[PDB]
Amino acid sequence: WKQAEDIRDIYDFRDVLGTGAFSEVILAEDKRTQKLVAIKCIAKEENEIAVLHKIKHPNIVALDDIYESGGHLYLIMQLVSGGELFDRIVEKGFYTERDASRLIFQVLDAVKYLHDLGIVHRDLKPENLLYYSLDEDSKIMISDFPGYVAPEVLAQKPYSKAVDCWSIGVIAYILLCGYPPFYDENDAKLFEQILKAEYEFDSPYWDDISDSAKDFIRHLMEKDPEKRFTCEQALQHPWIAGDTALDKNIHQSVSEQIKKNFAKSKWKQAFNATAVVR
Ligand SMILES: Nc1ncnc2c1ncn2[C@@H]1O[C@H](COP(=O)(O)OP(=O)(O)OP(=O)(O)O)[C@@H](O)[C@H]1O
């Protein structure tokens, strides 16, 4: 933790890379080194810095430094130039259970590590899952330090690290069909479906998906936090540890469902479709 006289003495603030609820992420140059970073600027509505600065993991975005101004906190992060999770899936032509499995393994591995350090996302979502670079074989990254929230947290019951495993469960669902497992225009009923963990592998969107992927999802999207798979157990499941994930081209359907259920995606495919032509 440092205290900048004027942070712009240290960093050249450029483009807004993304936007949060209470934050915005900005592309900046470290003027001292010429290296490119992402800076999360958080408005003012240590113990955290200590553990957060100790985070060293391939599939987690590094917290390089922290500066504090009059009314802001500036988190100097590893720059990632790959884009969000669903954006890439929608923009690329071939998608399989295998690609989904290879993505979940990484998320599990990263989250497991975070739980060993005592960190608990609790708000892990696809917007927090970014590709490291633009290449096809690029790894996924957790950036951060509406259905994704575990039933117990919404029940205001006591909860633990297991809430992240539920969140990972939900992402795996969308990664295989393209739409959230809990959907309703009325917010009140939506929270009831989540609290009851009531969901199905409805046809025909779930016709080509293997049984092992379903069983896997069932064990993470478990209402009981004590029956729910840990990161370790899910990492030991055949769908992640074995060879049960299929190589069926399930892209078109998953992609269209994402474009339908997520506003950003429909024209992210369009921008990229036009930008690549040149
Ligand atoms: N290290 C990074 N490199 C490049 N882009 C990033 C980086 N971190 C975040 N972004 C972009 O900025 C967005 C904001 O990230 P965050 O602000 O961490 O996500 P969020 O969905 O807004 O979660 P929250 O509302 O809790 O802040 C990301 O979705 C992504 O588009």
Author numbering: 10 to 54, 64 to 163, 182 to 314
The article reads:
When activated, CaM binds to and stimulates the activities of a family of Ca2+/CaM-dependent serine/threonine protein kinases (CaMKs), thereby regulating their functions. However, the regulation mechanism of CaMKI remains elusive. Here we report four crystal structures of three truncation variants of human CaMKIα, namely CaMKI320 (residues 1–320), CaMKI315 (residues 1–315), and CaMKI293 (residues 1–293), which correspond to the aforementioned three truncation forms of CaMKI, respectively. The catalytic core of CaMKI takes a canonical bilobate architecture, with the N-terminal lobe (N lobe) consisting of five antiparallel β-strands and a prominent helix named helix αC and the C-terminal lobe (C lobe) comprised primarily of α-helices.
